[PDB]
């Protein structure tokens, strides 16, 4: 295994990664960062 | 009266550009940078396009 810097938040009873990959990946470029979808009302 | 009166204005009259080197780097560092509310979505509306 290898040590890696990342943030881990405990919610409820489960330790989950809290990844917001917009900086390392999808950056300064031409790819659609998902999670910005649209809704129709 | 010849010894004391040019050590205080070439000590204070040759450090004027030592009153010169902070106000010409914010007259284009404060005359090449305007206003704010739009930066803030300079990180909420443009990575891909």
Curated annotation (Swiss-Prot), chain A:
Coiled coil: none annotated. Self-assembles to form an icosahedral capsid with a T=16 symmetry, about 200 nm in diameter, and consisting of 150 hexons and 12 pentons (total of 162 capsomers). Hexons form the edges and faces of the capsid and are each composed of six MCP molecules. In contrast, one penton is found at each of the 12 vertices. Eleven of the pentons are MCP pentamers, while the last vertex is occupied by the portal complex. Homomultimer. Makes the hexons and eleven out of twelve pentons. Interacts with triplex proteins 1/TRX1 and 2/TRX2; adjacent capsomers are linked together in groups of three by triplexes, heterotrimeric complexes composed of one molecule of TRX1 and two molecules of TRX2. Interacts with scaffold protein; this interaction allows efficient MCP transport to the host nucleus. Interacts with capsid vertex component 2/CVC2. Interacts with the small capsomere-interacting protein/SCP. Belongs to the herpesviridae major capsid protein family. It comes from Varicella-zoster virus (strain Dumas) (HHV-3). This is Major capsid protein. It comes from the Viruses. It is found in: Virion; Host nucleus. The chain holds residues 377 to 417 of 1396 of the full protein.
């Amino acid at each position: 295994n290898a040590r890696v810097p990342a943030d881990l938040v405990i919610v409820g009873d489960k330790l989950v990664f809290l990844e917001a990959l917009e900086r390392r990946v999808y950056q300064a470029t031409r790819v659609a960062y998902p999670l910005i979808g649209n809704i129709d009302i | 009266r010849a010894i004391q009166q040019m050590a205080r204005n070439l000590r204070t009259v040759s450090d004027s550009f030592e009153r010169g080197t902070a106000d010409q780097l914010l007259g284009v560092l404060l005359e090449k940078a305007p206003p704010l509310s739009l930066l803030s979505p300079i990180n909420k509306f443009q990575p891909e396009g």
